[PDB]
């Protein structure tokens, strides 16, 4: 069914992925930054 969606879409949707154009612009560095929630946060979160 994915191949049916692709064969429907191919004649009327264009596609890229940036690396097919952007030979000289950066990829994102992406940071999942965790945080320790505070005392007032733990007190209200636990009460909820």
């Amino acid at each position: 069914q994915l191949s049916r969606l692709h064969m429907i879409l191919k004649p009327f949707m264009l596609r890229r992925i940036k690396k097919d154009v952007e030979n000289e612009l950066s990829d994102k560095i992406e940071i999942l930054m965790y945080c320790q929630l505070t005392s007032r946060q733990k007190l209200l979160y636990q009460a909820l």
Binding site: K28, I29, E30, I31, L32, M33, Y34, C35, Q36
Partner: protein, 447 residues
């Protein structure tokens, strides 16, 4: 792609009762074998199970218990268990019996300050307040000129108002050096003014100025709010005897002079009781009568033991917990008289005694385990079994006290956990009260 995690500060410090989190009772009020940090003491914990329902019932006044039993049997740990079992809102007032020997107030009255601190009170205080940037400020004159009113123009994000206020507020604004552009807060009940510095609108107006600047206040200039105050009857009693409220030259200066205690008159506690009864009648107040814990009670003076007869028979008094580690002592201040727990037989009727008792080796091992995992340390079973043996040789406190010193020795020696080779060294470095008394009796010619 990347992950990051952060923390930047120390923990709470560990302390001698910090493993105790409650009495470890079941729904029937029976004691679990090991729960909430405590183990053993099932009779004393079941008894304290009645007492935590005694406190929470509120009906009773001046009921008292005496925890009695040898050194290290957990008496002050059980009063700490009660303090945790009641939670934060019911006041628990810790006291040590030797705190009555003040140099500012009579021994017979330090007790009343402690009693009155143990009756808590929750008040829905409505405070009504003015706040804003001061956009205009003018006093209005009258013949002996005197000031009759002040006009203050105040501004907030929600608008502006221009208020007639009392000359005591003007005297407060002058005291606080308030000027146009200052953000201020005034509460009309206290007549009390707080300056917060010039509004952020003025933060560009000089290249170099002493001021902190604040964002313009929000909501209307005049507004009222509840503060749900927690307060105690002592905190009402003292606050009237050396008054720091109001705004006059006298109250402004009672706030500077040395804060000496004073023998609060029985009449003031009378007029305070009338005022808090009116706040309870008005539904503004809830009383929360709590606990006074006189630890080491065996050394109150006989003056104090005889005062406790009047205090424990008061219709107002909190519930009281005493503790004693003592046998048939002489009663302090008498020189002649000896009695159980060091407490007069006259007072020893007025208390439900909770007998607290010595430990089996199994309970010592189990406390030492629960204690080791509270001090944050890993200990091998052969080393913990060896501390159980040191418990049978000496005392529970010495056996507990070796744990952290053994963990320092272990991490110096490069191990992750206490091995028996560490405890067997710490036992040689640090004597206990029994083993030191042997060398100190043998060498008694030279001390």
């Amino acid at each position: 792609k990347i992950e990051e995690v952060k923390s930047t500060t120390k923990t709470q410090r560990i302390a001698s009762h910090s493993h105790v989190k409650g009495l470890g009772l079941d729904e029937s009020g029976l004691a679990k074998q090991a729960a909430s940090g405590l183990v053993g003491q099932e009779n004393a914990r079941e008894a304290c199970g009645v007492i935590v329902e005694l406190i929470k019932s509120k009906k009773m006044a001046g009921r008292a218990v005496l925890l009695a039993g040898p050194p290290g049997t957990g008496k002050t740990a059980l009063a700490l268990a009660i303090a945790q079992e009641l939670g934060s809102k019911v006041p628990f007032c810790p006291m040590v019996g030797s705190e009555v020997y003040s140099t500012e107030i009579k021994k017979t009255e330090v007790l009343m300050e402690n009693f009155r601190r143990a009756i808590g009170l929750r008040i829905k205080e409505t405070k009504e307040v003015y706040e804003g940037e001061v956009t205009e400020l003018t006093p209005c004159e009258t013949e002996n000129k005197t000031i009759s009113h002040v006009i203050i123009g105040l501004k907030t994000a929600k608008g502006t108002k221009q208020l007639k206020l009392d000359p005591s507020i003007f005297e407060s604004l002058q005291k606080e050096r308030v000027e146009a552009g200052d953000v201020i807060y005034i509460e009309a009940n206290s007549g009390a003014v707080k300056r917060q510095g010039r509004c952020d609108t003025y933060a560009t107006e000089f290249d170099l100025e002493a001021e902190e600047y604040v964002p313009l206040p929000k909501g209307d200039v005049h507004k009222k709010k509840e503060i749900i105050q927690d307060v105690t009857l002592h905190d009402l009693d003292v606050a009237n005897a050396r008054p720091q409220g109001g705004q006059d030259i006298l109250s402004m200066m009672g706030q500077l002079m040395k804060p000496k205690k004073t023998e609060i008159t029985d009449k003031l506690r009378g007029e305070i009781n009338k005022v808090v009864n009116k706040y309870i009648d008005q539904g503004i107040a809830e009383l929360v009568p709590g606990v006074l814990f006189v630890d080491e009670v065996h050394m109150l003076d006989i003056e104090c033991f005889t005062y406790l007869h009047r205090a424990l028979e008061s219709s107002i008094a909190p519930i009281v917990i005493f503790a004693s580690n003592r046998g048939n002592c002489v009663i302090r201040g008498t020189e002649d008289i000896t009695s159980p727990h060091g407490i007069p037989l006259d007072l020893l009727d007025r208390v439900m005694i909770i007998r607290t008792m010595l430990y089996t080796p199994q309970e010592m091992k189990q406390i030492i385990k629960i204690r080791a995992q509270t001090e944050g340390i890993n200990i091998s079973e052969e080393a913990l079994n060896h501390l159980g043996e040191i418990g049978t040789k000496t005392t529970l406190r010495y056996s507990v006290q070796l744990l952290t010193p053994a963990n320092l020795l272990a991490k110096i020696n490069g191990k992750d956990s206490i091995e028996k080779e560490h405890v067997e060294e710490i036992s040689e470095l640090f004597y206990d009260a029994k083993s030191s008394a042997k060398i100190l009796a043998d060498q008694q010619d030279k001390y």
